[PDB]
Design an enzyme around this catalytic site. Structure first.
Site, short mmCIF file in Angstrom:
data_model
loop_
_atom_site.label_atom_id
_atom_site.label_comp_id
_atom_site.label_asym_id
_atom_site.label_seq_id
_atom_site.Cartn_x
_atom_site.Cartn_y
_atom_site.Cartn_z
N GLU A 1 -29.81 73.54 68.67
CA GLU A 1 -29.29 73.63 67.31
C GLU A 1 -29.94 74.82 66.61
O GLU A 1 -30.67 75.59 67.23
CB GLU A 1 -29.51 72.33 66.56
CG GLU A 1 -28.33 71.39 66.61
CD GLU A 1 -27.17 71.86 65.76
OE1 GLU A 1 -27.16 71.56 64.55
OE2 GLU A 1 -26.25 72.51 66.31
N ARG A 2 -29.70 74.97 65.32
CA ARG A 2 -30.15 76.14 64.59
C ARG A 2 -31.67 76.13 64.41
O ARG A 2 -32.29 75.08 64.25
CB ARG A 2 -29.49 76.20 63.22
CG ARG A 2 -28.00 76.12 63.23
CD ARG A 2 -27.48 76.01 61.82
NE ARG A 2 -26.03 75.96 61.77
CZ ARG A 2 -25.33 74.84 61.83
NH1 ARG A 2 -25.95 73.68 61.96
NH2 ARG A 2 -24.01 74.88 61.77
N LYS B 1 -22.33 65.76 61.91
CA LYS B 1 -23.19 65.01 62.81
C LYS B 1 -24.65 65.41 62.71
O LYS B 1 -25.51 64.66 63.16
CB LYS B 1 -22.73 65.17 64.25
CG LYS B 1 -22.60 66.61 64.66
CD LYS B 1 -22.49 66.75 66.15
CE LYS B 1 -22.27 68.20 66.50
NZ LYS B 1 -21.14 68.77 65.71
N1 LIG Z 1 -22.23 62.80 53.98
C1 LIG Z 1 -21.77 64.02 53.63
N2 LIG Z 1 -21.35 64.27 52.37
C2 LIG Z 1 -20.89 65.48 52.01
N3 LIG Z 1 -20.81 66.52 52.85
C3 LIG Z 1 -21.20 66.41 54.14
C4 LIG Z 1 -21.71 65.12 54.61
N4 LIG Z 1 -22.02 65.26 55.90
C5 LIG Z 1 -21.73 66.55 56.23
N5 LIG Z 1 -21.24 67.23 55.19
C6 LIG Z 1 -20.83 68.64 55.21
O1 LIG Z 1 -20.91 69.16 56.54
C7 LIG Z 1 -21.57 70.42 56.54
C8 LIG Z 1 -22.51 70.56 57.73
O2 LIG Z 1 -22.15 69.72 58.81
P1 LIG Z 1 -23.21 69.59 60.00
O3 LIG Z 1 -23.97 68.31 59.79
O4 LIG Z 1 -23.94 70.91 60.05
O5 LIG Z 1 -22.28 69.47 61.30
P2 LIG Z 1 -22.45 70.47 62.54
O6 LIG Z 1 -23.92 70.43 62.88
O7 LIG Z 1 -21.56 69.91 63.62
O8 LIG Z 1 -21.97 71.78 61.98
C9 LIG Z 1 -22.40 70.49 55.28
O9 LIG Z 1 -22.25 71.76 54.65
C10 LIG Z 1 -21.85 69.40 54.39
O10 LIG Z 1 -21.23 69.98 53.25
MG LIG Z 2 -25.99 71.00 62.85
#
Ligand SMILES: Nc1ncnc2c1ncn2[C@@H]1O[C@H](COP(=O)(O)OP(=O)(O)O)[C@@H](O)[C@H]1O
Ligand SMILES: [Mg+2]
Lengths: 520, 32, 193, 70
Positions: A183-184, A157
């Site tokens: 967030e981070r 997300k």
């Molecule tokens: N469209 C995408 N294609 C490939 N990997 C994805 C995609 N979206 C998210 N990811 C994977 O999700 C990980 C991070 O998710 P993130 O967006 O940080 O969710 P959250 O913030 O809830 O942890 C990334 O390391 C990535 O590898």
């Molecule tokens: Mg995140």
């Protein structure tokens, strides 16, 4: 200065009590602590009844003594808003934390305000095309509405909201405000460098030509700060909507951190806890925030609020309260992210009020409802595929299984921002092209195509192109593999000639640790 | 509060007797 | 409506009664009269049993307790402040809070009388040049223009010197702790050197 | 050099009201800070966590079986 200078009475973590001799401040007003290391801003949350307020501190309370004088500002927490904030990073009290001088402030607006009334509301339904296939197909985003990206702990997300920033936030024309709520800090620095490199943030004297204001209260901040950074991002967006009168964007990251910060604070205010451990005033605090993010008659705030779910639990009350405040909901699931599908949008739980046959057309509506029907009839048979196997189903059911396996791979899409770690270039799909593509797969024009041709492609041309590429390379074969590697004429040197080319680094005498510790 | 400032009232510290002398004769018919 | 501010802030629900009592008796300038009256009531609770039965028994009705505290405190030149205080504290059964309202009142009056206590504990009886040299070194620990008093105690465990007991801070200028910190300072070097 | 530089410092002390369940309700310490490392008489350290209006809550960095009331 005997009156209107109170002293700190008691401190319980991030909750500070100030006791006054006269003229207690109003609730939700800002106090300043005298003689603290950082500028520690308190915020009155209650009146305890012994001439004592109960304050939430916007910074750490480490080092507070119970004799410290606290002055009153006579006002709430007021942030510098205006056109001059475009291109700055702000914390919860309106200070710049990007080290570019002070903030050019047109007006100084407080963060506590009433929501716009019922008669000031606008009732408009126009689509917002984002280029993602699942969003523009099954839950189309309202242009001026509210958007929640549910799903938690590694479903994507935060990647999806960067893709939404990269798609919509440059082709919008209006401003943008990113409010990072817990967030981070690394993600805020990544977005700051990526917005400088893209040109929506400029530095120097041409700062005013930028189109994005950052407000960060990221996850290192104490729970007093994370409970108020969403309100600061709301004040910055509400100056552009209410006074500049033009349509903005407001991407709030992890709005669960607002509810969680208020729950960390409300554990120590001595209130009785509600269900699973949250505060009793969850719904009212979340309403008093989320009803300020609304499109009025004069302007528009198009918000994409990422909502973290705790332990992937949609019956948790902190996202289930948030479900009522959102127009278009985009639930992400980890059971689909473990199937390699990206973005992991759950197609049978992510809804929208824009999915209506009067607004987006009966063709798009009937394609979306047929896609949901095919996926749901697939989901009903999942245990039968699990235990009994694919070799006893009906003909129509093992055709809907193949059609559903093709549209599940087809809903996945490579992103314009995700190619830093995946290699596949991102594909921005238009709206009518993905509607026509899903109409074709629903009617059955692509039954004989392979299923992995649908995986990670943009539109209906590229699935047939990937089928042609992946069904060449099962029949592509070269004779003797055309190496010509040995005996290259004045190309490869000897090994020791290449060794002598290497410059040699010296070793600076065993870590040198005592020489740069007696230096300070 | 403490005990250290509360044990020290066990020793008499009035330095006047215009209350404990008169009402000590009035209290017994008052409870009678 | 216009109450004079207390010199030091305090705790709740028993110190607040003492804060209000000091404020009211400082509006009336009877600040040492009511302290004497509260001391008299402490010893009056110490003397008889039919008065502490009005504060420890939970089966006394509030009507007879209110009428006893009024008809006893009708006379003998009692202050209006102490009379109305004991009426309000006997109407609600708060007569047992007397022992810890008077201590907070004494802390308030000690803040006002601008007099702080101390206690110097020694090994020998102090002579008059030991005492007048003690006051100059102990005054450097107070923080404003006060009236720091010097109490005397004798304890044989110290091998000379003095220890100041301010009831909130302690200055151990004794020799028995000097040799105790001496023998600790040597043994941290013999294990090293 | 240890005797010619030896000033016994004034130290603001406080009594222990109650100890149990990993906390030390410490009377006094009006000059303590929220999160200040306090040190008991038994040598075991502590942190002034909850600065209340009538005491100071102290968690005990170590075994609290060496700490008494007083
Ligand atoms: N469209 C995408 N294609 C490939 N990997 C994805 C995609 N979206 C998210 N990811 C994977 O999700 C990980 C991070 O998710 P993130 O967006 O940080 O969710 P959250 O913030 O809830 O942890 C990334 O390391 C990535 O590898
Ligand atoms: Mg995140």
């Amino acid at each position: 200065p005997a009156i209107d200078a109170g002293y700190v009475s008691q401190v319980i973590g991030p909750v500070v009590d100030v006791r006054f001799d006269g003229e207690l401040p109003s609730i939700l007003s800002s106090l300043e602590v005298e003689g603290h290391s950082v500028r520690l801003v308190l915020e009155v949350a209650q009146h305890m009844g012994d001439n004592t307020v109960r304050c939430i501190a916007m910074d750490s309370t480490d080092g507070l003594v119970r004799g410290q004088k606290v002055v009153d500002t006579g006002s709430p927490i007021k942030v510098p808003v205006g056109r001059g904030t475009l291109g700055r990073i702000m914390n919860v009290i309106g200070e710049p934390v990007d080290e570019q001088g002070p903030i050019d402030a047109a007006d100084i607006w407080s963060i506590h305000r009433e929501a716009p009334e019922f008669t000031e509301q606008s009732t408009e339904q126009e689509i917002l095309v984002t280029g993602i296939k699942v969003v523009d197909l099954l839950a189309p985003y309202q242009r001026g509405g509210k958007i929640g990206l549910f799903g938690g702990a590694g479903v994507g997300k935060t990647v999806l909201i960067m893709e939404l920033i990269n798609n919509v936030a440059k082709a919008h024309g209006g401003f943008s405000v990113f409010a990072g709520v817990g967030e981070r800090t690394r993600e805020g620095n990544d977005l700051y460098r990526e917005m400088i490199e893209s040109g929506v943030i400029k530095l120097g004297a041409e700062r005013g030509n930028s189109k994005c204001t950052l407000v960060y209260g990221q996850m290192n901040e104490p729970p007093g700060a994370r409970a108020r950074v969403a309100l600061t991002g709301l004040t910055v967006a509400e100056y552009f909507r209410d006074i500049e009168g033009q349509d903005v964007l407001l991407f709030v990251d992890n709005i669960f951190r607002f509810t969680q910060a208020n729950s960390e604070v409300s554990a120590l205010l001595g209130r009785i806890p509600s269900a699973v451990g949250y505060q009793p005033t969850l719904a009212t605090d979340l309403g008093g925030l989320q009803e300020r993010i609304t499109t009025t008659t004069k302007g528009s705030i198009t918000s994409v609020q990422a909502v973290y779910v705790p332990a992937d639990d949609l019956t948790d009350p902190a996202p289930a309260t948030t479900f009522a405040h959102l127009d278009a909901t985009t639930v992400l699931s980890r059971s689909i992210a473990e199937l390699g599908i990206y973005p992991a949008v759950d197609p049978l739980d992510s809804t929208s009020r824009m999915l209506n046959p009067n607004v987006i057309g009966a063709e798009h509506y009937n394609v979306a409802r047929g896609v949901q029907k095919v996926l749901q009839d697939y989901k009903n048979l999942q245990d039968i595929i699990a235990i009994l196997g694919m070799d006893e189903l009906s003909e129509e059911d093992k055709l809907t299984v193949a059609r559903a396996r093709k549209i599940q791979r087809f809903l996945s899409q490579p992103f314009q921002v995700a190619e830093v770690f995946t290699g596949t270039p991102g594909k921005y799909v238009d709206l009518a092209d993905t509607i026509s593509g899903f109409q074709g797969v629903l009617t059955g024009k692509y039954d004989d195509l392979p299923e992995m041709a649908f995986y990670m492609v943009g539109d209906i041309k590229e699935v047939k192109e990937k089928a042609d590429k992946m069904a060449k390379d099962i029949a592509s074969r070269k004779e003797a593999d055309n190496k010509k590697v040995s005996e290259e004429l004045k190309d490869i040197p000897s090994l020791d000639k290449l060794v002598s080319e290497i410059k040699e680094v010296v070793i600076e005498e065993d870590d040198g640790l005592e020489e740069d510790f007696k230096a300070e | 509060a403490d005990a250290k400032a509360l044990d020290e009232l066990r020793k008499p510290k009035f330095s006047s007797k215009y209350l404990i002398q008169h009402v000590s004769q009035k209290l017994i018919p008052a409870v009678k | 409506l216009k109450l004079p501010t207390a010199p030091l802030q305090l705790s709740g629900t028993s110190a607040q009664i003492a804060t209000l009592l000091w404020q009211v008796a400082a509006k009336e300038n009877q600040l040492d009269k009511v302290q004497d009256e509260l001391y008299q009531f402490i010893e009056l609770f110490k003397q008889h049993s039919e008065l502490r039965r009005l504060a420890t028994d939970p089966f006394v009705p509030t009507l007879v307790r209110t009428k006893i505290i009024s008809s006893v405190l009708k006379d003998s030149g009692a202050s209006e402040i102490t009379k109305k205080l004991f009426e309000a504290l006997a109407d609600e059964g708060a007569l047992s809070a007397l022992l810890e309202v008077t201590v907070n009142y004494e802390e308030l009056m000690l803040a006002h009388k601008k007099e702080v206590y101390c206690t110097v504990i020694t090994a020998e009886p102090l002579d008059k040049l030991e005492r007048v040299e003690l006051t100059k070194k102990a005054e450097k620990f107070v923080d404003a223009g006060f009236k720091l008093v010097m109490q005397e105690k004798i304890d044989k465990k110290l091998l000379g010197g003095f220890v100041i007991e301010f009831s909130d801070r302690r200055v151990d200028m004794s020799t028995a702790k000097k040799v105790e910190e001496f023998n600790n300072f040597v043994n941290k070097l013999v294990l090293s050197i | 050099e240890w005797e010619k530089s030896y000033q016994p410092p004034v130290i603001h002390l406080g009594r222990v009201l109650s100890v149990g369940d990993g906390i030390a309700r410490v009377y006094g310490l009006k000059s303590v800070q929220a999160g200040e490392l306090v040190c008991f008489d038994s040598g075991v350290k502590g942190m002034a966590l909850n600065l209340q209006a009538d005491h100071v809550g102290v968690v005990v960095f170590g075994n609290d079986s060496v700490i008494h009331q007083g």
